[PDB]
Design a protein around this nucleic acid. Structure first.
Length: 88
RNA sequence: ACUGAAACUGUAGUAGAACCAAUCGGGGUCGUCAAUA
């Protein structure tokens, strides 16, 4: 399937993605193959996931695990690196 | 003889402290100008 997009309109000056700096800069933003700034899809997934986690956490009445947190693990997948013990 | 999955390069941090747009100056006062006959 194809056809969906996320449109991001940056409404203030923005910084993303890198723990490195250039000659006069101690923090340099991330740049695509065109050397142009871009929002990496892992940053965008992580940001959008977090905001869905907020919505689900509200719909769950603040429960950290529940029905709507299940839906987040449905849409964005489980995070097995967090869970510990015998997750079956 | 079969693509690992999942993971925000992020968190804290006042481009700021110091620095006189300032120093000196009577709104004043006299003989010049031209060259010949």
């Amino acid at each position: 399937m194809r056809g969906i997009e996320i449109t991001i309109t940056m409404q203030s000056d923005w910084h993303v993605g890198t723990g490195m700096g250039r000659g006069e800069l101690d923090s340099v933003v991330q740049r695509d193959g065109d050397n142009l700034p871009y929002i990496p899809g892992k940053t965008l997934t992580g940001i959008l996931r977090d905001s869905c986690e907020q919505v689900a956490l509200g719909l769950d009445n603040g429960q950290t695990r529940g029905l709507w947190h299940g839906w987040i693990n449905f849409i964005f997948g489980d995070q097995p690196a967090l869970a510990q013990g015998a997750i079956e």
